[PDB]
Design a protein around this ligand. Structure first.
Ligand SMILES: *[C@@H]1O[C@H](CO)[C@@H](O[C@@H]2O[C@H](CO)[C@@H](O[C@H]3O[C@H](CO)[C@@H](O)[C@H](O)[C@@H]3O)[C@H](O)[C@H]2NC(C)=O)[C@H](O)[C@H]1NC(C)=O
Ligand SMILES: *[C@@H]1O[C@H](CO)[C@@H](O[C@@H]2O[C@H](CO)[C@@H](O[C@H]3O[C@H](CO)[C@@H](O)[C@H](O)[C@@H]3O)[C@H](O)[C@H]2NC(C)=O)[C@H](O)[C@H]1NC(C)=O
Ligand SMILES: *[C@@H]1O[C@H](CO)[C@@H](O[C@@H]2O[C@H](CO)[C@@H](O[C@H]3O[C@H](CO)[C@@H](O)[C@H](O)[C@@H]3O)[C@H](O)[C@H]2NC(C)=O)[C@H](O)[C@H]1NC(C)=O
Ligand SMILES: *[C@@H]1O[C@H](CO)[C@@H](O[C@@H]2O[C@H](CO)[C@@H](O)[C@H](O)[C@H]2NC(C)=O)[C@H](O)[C@H]1NC(C)=O
Ligand SMILES: *[C@@H]1O[C@H](CO)[C@@H](O[C@@H]2O[C@H](CO)[C@@H](O)[C@H](O)[C@H]2NC(C)=O)[C@H](O)[C@H]1NC(C)=O
Ligand SMILES: *[C@@H]1O[C@H](CO)[C@@H](O)[C@H](O)[C@H]1NC(C)=O
Ligand SMILES: *[C@@H]1O[C@H](CO)[C@@H](O)[C@H](O)[C@H]1NC(C)=O
Ligand SMILES: *[C@@H]1O[C@H](CO)[C@@H](O)[C@H](O)[C@H]1NC(C)=O
Ligand SMILES: *[C@@H]1O[C@H](CO)[C@@H](O)[C@H](O)[C@H]1NC(C)=O
Ligand SMILES: *[C@@H]1O[C@H](CO)[C@@H](O)[C@H](O)[C@H]1NC(C)=O
Ligand SMILES: *[C@@H]1O[C@H](CO)[C@@H](O)[C@H](O)[C@H]1NC(C)=O
Ligand SMILES: *[C@@H]1O[C@H](CO)[C@@H](O)[C@H](O)[C@H]1NC(C)=O
Ligand SMILES: *[C@@H]1O[C@H](CO)[C@@H](O)[C@H](O)[C@H]1NC(C)=O
Lengths: 48, 49, 249, 384, 49, 48, 48, 49
């Protein structure tokens, strides 16, 4: 994305073109959370 | 052991004051990552033990 | 005036150890009680800082390269470093930057200059008045195409970096009780100023205080080292200022 | 409607069995915007930028710098004369809400057909050998036909460019170099020869030329933002600063939401932002008066709802996790709470636990087995 | 015997205080639920342990 | 494809203003005479 | 992406559209490594 | 193409197929006889690659 700060996108681009940058950030943050929740579920199995 | 808190009364008292700028626990909480307390406190674990 | 003060011994280059200096605030963001990592032009720690003297006999004022970025410092009394010239091949076919600090003010001026071959500013040495005054200036013979203007109303250290049209000057002052070298214990240079001068640069020089020849100036020394693209890790104290720093190389 | 129906909406069942459930976090919403810019009132010189007596030859492209002024950029977007007004750093309709640290105007004339080469990272002899924007360009490119103002019958040959270059020159460079090119390998010492070229060539801008072979005035307006003190801003008006209230702030185009507070951070004369460990803004220096404001996000937290199950009752109780009960009266419909229900908040029974504020459940000294686990030694159950 | 209980909100972590981002995040469907569910699944297991 | 309901909207424009009749664009007529939505679902046609 | 050979992508196409062809390979390959690392963690839990 | 003894008149302009072979400027361009060598769609150095 052009920037990582979500609000700096919304304060620089309009509703139809900003959606292209935001989809990005949504993709990589969702990849981040699935990485974390997988890593934590694996630990949870070790701790159990 | 040294710890990143057990949720001990994070009543925005620290997180809103001069702290909030120099604490990872306030950056975690402010980003929607929330640590939660155990069901059993260390006073009760001590009694079972 | 403009004159060749050629009264001097000519010497080879000389080096000393830089230690842990030439750190600075990498952008205008405040931070406290935190460790932060950045990739920027900085002075390589313990590298050979080149070492220069003004003596009696030996007025060590050559015209150095100025590639990438430069670190400059001097051990001083009586404020003999009066300014700097920064420029390309220097022949009035480009713009160039002059800076001086005369008795009344700092001047910053940017024109395609025709600077003197061995410039200085000259001062009456306790001549009857029980005091000193600047009388002489032998710095340029022309300044037609000009493009920026400003004027204002012991170890001294500076960083000069000239990136995407911006000449950023950082600085620090300290008192000293160390006989002649760069000290152990360190600080970050605070950003004194930025001028948007747009110019290319290749070379630089410094301007000192001083019958056309046969002259005296105070015993002083200066140090020059070059910035290099390198990764650094820094800490900010609880007051929110840099207090330790390491290079990842 | 209520915390029970929000759990039914969370669980996708019209029956909910006995237990405790997360649902949407709450937060308190901002009651106003606040706007803060460094008051400056002189307009920016866009008439000087666009109504020049004459424009540069593009190999000498004129570079202007702007500072300390107000720009109603929408005026320029409204001026229908522009055949292209293409923007990269921002959508052009946003420009009036933004502030910039520095603003540079690059100006010249070209044949209207090569306006495609002006776009960032493109190629073609102009974009290649004499003028080009970097990959991460942040500004707008503007173009218009100038045949009437700038043609001469035999051509204004004054407007030239460069056909030759040793190497593709760096982004945002200019090259005055008149040196003769050596397209064949012979060292062409002197001003001329077979295989040797004068490095520049020019447009015969005759008025009869085809559309875009015609002379087009071009400006690129450009800027850098959000890391250093702003010097240029759009026309929007500053408003009263407030502390200890939730506000949808904007400082220098740094928009966001939070509670402003008097900072004890001792910023030196140069800085203007603080950023937290998450690379996210957490203090700012006020642009009207030089003090530092600490900015904390407004109040929020996880709601969790406790239920004896719908078979047993439609009574619930609510946990506001991590919250001291003295902030629950501040969770009032003075602003829209995100969980929109608010009927437990009337209180009379409010209880503070280590886990957060618990509401709707009678605290008692008579202990029992942990029937529904709230947390930190506290549990709940359904009883007379 | 346990690890710290944790919740992480997808909406605040991804889209924090942008309404239209939260309207974009919806297009991925019930992922925002699965993350909270899985974390609740670990959190309960710590008390079980 | 069969359509659930169909509308021909008709008017005259300056040829330079064709961009305004892109789904997202802005400036005068797209501002305050004739607006397409951000999720415009249909087809357009213009001739001199 | 039009090819998995990286030098095809950086030779045959321009810097700003080849960047779009490249983010496909970064994204697919990073998912591939994440698949291997997740699989190895899950295995290593059974070997433990 | 060039060394040929007798060319056509322009009124009778000939035309050759050049195919299945390697086409250098390396001799061609560098022969100092060519008073004109003017290329429109490509620069003279980029013909070989
Ligand atoms: C920077 O200083 C430059 C030198 O003083 C100056 O360039 C000079 O400009 C004049 C025109 O005002 C040129 O005069 C020649 O103009 C054409 C060029 O082909 C000739 O037909 C004329 O007979 C005449 O000789 C000078 O040749 C030129 N000097 C050089 C060395 O190129 C710039 O104008 C100055 N720039 C600014 C911004 O002031
Ligand atoms: C270049 O300078 C131009 C002349 O000052 C300027 O354009 C002119 O702008 C004014 C308003 O500032 C317009 O004046 C009046 O025009 C109509 C007449 O019906 C009124 O409805 C308006 O409200 C207004 O009072 C001129 O029409 C306009 N003239 C031209 C020739 O365009 C430009 O703004 C400058 N160039 C740029 C690109 O900014
Ligand atoms: C037309 O046909 C001509 C005959 O083959 C050819 O002329 C030859 O051109 C080459 C250069 O390309 C010369 O090569 C020699 O050049 C010098 C001579 O001192 C040496 O350094 C070299 O090593 C090499 O021996 C030939 O001398 C020259 N021969 C003659 C008779 O002139 C043309 O190049 C052809 N032109 C076209 C366009 O087809
Ligand atoms: C200073 O001394 C230098 C020689 O050391 C002089 O420089 C020469 O000046 C002439 C023109 O007057 C040039 O043609 C020479 O090419 C120069 N030589 C060098 C080596 O630069 C200079 O003229 C003297 N200046 C003063 C003020 O006396
Ligand atoms: C919930 O918030 C209130 C308000 O800050 C807390 O009350 C303060 O408690 C401290 C510590 O006992 C006292 O020094 C203050 O004088 C109290 N202030 C007021 C206005 O009453 C309350 O204690 C908080 N809950 C907890 C568990 O700390
Ligand atoms: C510094 O300079 C000396 C020569 O005076 C050289 O021997 C030494 O290796 C240099 N050290 C570095 C790190 O450049
Ligand atoms: C700066 O001047 C030098 C010396 O003539 C030259 O080699 C270099 O290409 C110039 N650099 C720029 C950025 O113009
Ligand atoms: C300081 O510099 C400016 C420009 O050279 C000059 O006008 C001024 O008189 C200088 N001051 C003194 C004390 O000479
Ligand atoms: C003494 O100071 C005055 C200025 O107050 C100056 O004009 C004079 O030249 C000085 N004396 C000498 C010997 O230069
Ligand atoms: C840091 O802050 C404390 C408290 O104001 C003060 O004692 C100390 O001198 C400060 N140091 C600096 C370098 O600001
Ligand atoms: C805002 O206006 C007031 C009153 O004239 C002035 O004190 C203040 O300095 C202005 N802001 C700036 C950025 O100068
Ligand atoms: C509640 O559950 C019990 C056992 O299944 C059942 O007898 C009772 O009818 C249920 N309540 C209602 C309102 O049906
Ligand atoms: C619980 O005991 C405390 C004293 O330890 C007392 O303040 C409180 O009123 C008691 N409540 C009940 C319901 O017994």
């Amino acid at each position: 994305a052009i920037s990582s700060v979500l609000n700096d996108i919304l304060s620089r681009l309009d509703k139809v073109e900003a959606e292209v940058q935001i989809d990005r950030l949504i993709t990589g943050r969702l990849q981040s959370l699935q990485t974390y929740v997988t890593q934590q579920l694996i630990r949870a199995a070790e701790i159990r | 052991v040294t710890l990143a808190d057990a949720g001990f009364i994070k009543q925005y008292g620290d997180c809103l004051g001069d702290i909030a700028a120099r604490d990872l626990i306030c950056a975690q909480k402010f980003n929607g990552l929330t640590v939660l307390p155990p069901l059993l406190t260390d006073e009760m674990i001590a009694q079972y033990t | 005036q403009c004159v060749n003060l050629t009264t001097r011994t000519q010497l080879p280059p000389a080096y000393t150890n830089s230690f842990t200096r030439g750190v600075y605030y990498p952008d205008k963001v405040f931070r406290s009680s935190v460790l932060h990592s950045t990739q920027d032009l900085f002075l390589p720690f313990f590298s050979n800082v080149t070492w220069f003297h003004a003596i009696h006999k030996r007025f060590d004022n050559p015209v150095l390269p100025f590639n990438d970025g430069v670190y400059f410092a001097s051990t001083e009394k009586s404020n003999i470093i009066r300014g700097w010239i920064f420029g390309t091949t220097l022949d009035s076919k480009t713009q160039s930057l002059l800076i001086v600090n005369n008795a009344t003010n700092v001047v910053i001026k940017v024109c395609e200059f025709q600077f003197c071959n061995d410039p200085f500013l000259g001062v009456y040495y306790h001549k009857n008045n029980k005091s000193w005054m600047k009388s002489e200036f032998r710095v340029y013979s022309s300044a037609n195409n000009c493009t920026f203007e400003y004027v204002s109303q012991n170890l001294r250290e500076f960083v000069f970096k000239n990136i995407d049209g911006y000449f950023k000057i950082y600085s620090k002052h300290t008192p000293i009780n160390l006989v002649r070298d760069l000290p152990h214990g360190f600080s970050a240079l605070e950003p004194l100023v930025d001028l948007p001068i747009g110019i290319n640069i290749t070379r630089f020089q410094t301007l000192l205080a001083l019958s056309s020849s046969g002259w005296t100036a105070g015993a002083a020394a200066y140090y020059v080292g070059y910035l290099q693209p390198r990764t650094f890790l820094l800490k900010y104290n609880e007051n929110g200022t840099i207090t330790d720093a390491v290079d990842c190389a | 409607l209520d915390p029970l129906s929000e759990t039914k909406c969370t669980l996708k069942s019209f029956t909910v069995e006995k237990g405790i459930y997360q649902t949407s976090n709450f937060r308190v919403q901002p009651t106003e915007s606040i706007v803060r810019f460094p008051n400056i009132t002189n307009l920016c010189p866009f008439g000087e930028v666009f109504n020049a007596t004459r424009f540069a030859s593009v190999y000498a492209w004129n570079r202007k710098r702007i500072s300390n002024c107000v720009a109603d950029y929408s005026v320029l977007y409204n001026s229908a004369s522009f055949s292209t007004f293409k923007c990269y750093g921002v959508s052009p309709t946003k420009l009036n809400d933004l502030c910039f640290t520095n603003v540079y105007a690059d100006s010249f004339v070209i044949r209207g057909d090569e306006v495609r080469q002006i776009a960032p990272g493109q190629t073609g002899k102009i974009a290649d050998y004499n003028y080009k924007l970097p990959d991460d360009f942040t500004g707008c490119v503007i173009a218009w036909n100038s045949n009437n103002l700038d043609s001469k019958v035999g051509g204004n040959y004054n407007y030239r460019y460069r056909l030759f270059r040793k190497s593709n020159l760096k982004p945002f460079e200019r090259d005055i170099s008149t040196e003769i090119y050596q397209a064949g390998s012979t060292p062409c010492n002197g001003v001329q020869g077979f295989n040797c070229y004068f490095p520049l060539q020019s447009y015969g801008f005759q008025p009869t030329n085809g559309v875009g072979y015609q002379p087009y005035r071009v400006v690129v307006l450009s800027f850098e933002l959000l890391h250093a003190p702003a010097t240029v801003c759009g026309p929007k008006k500053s408003t009263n600063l407030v502390k200890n209230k939730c506000v949808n702030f904007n400082f220098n185009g740094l928009t966001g939401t939070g509670v402003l507070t008097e900072s004890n951070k001792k910023f030196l004369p140069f800085q203007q932002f603080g950023r937290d460990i998450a690379d996210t803004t957490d203090a700012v220096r006020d642009p009207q008066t030089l003090e530092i404001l600490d900015i904390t996000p407004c109040s929020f937290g996880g709601v969790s709802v406790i239920t004896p199950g719908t078979n047993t009752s439609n009574q619930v109780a609510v946990l506001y996790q991590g919250v001291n009960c003295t902030e629950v009266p501040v969770a009032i419909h003075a602003d829209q709470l995100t969980p929109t229900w608010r009927v437990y908040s009337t209180g009379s029974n409010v209880f503070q636990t280590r886990a957060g504020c618990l509401i709707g459940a009678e605290h008692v000294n008579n202990s029992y087995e942990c029937d529904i686990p709230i947390g930190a030694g506290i549990c709940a159950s359904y009883q007379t | 015997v346990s690890m710290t209980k944790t919740s992480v909100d997808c909406t605040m972590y991804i889209c924090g205080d942008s309404t239209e981002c939260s309207n974009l995040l919806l297009q991925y469907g019930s992922f925002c639920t699965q993350l909270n569910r899985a974390l609740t699944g670990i959190a309960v297991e710590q008390d079980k342990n």
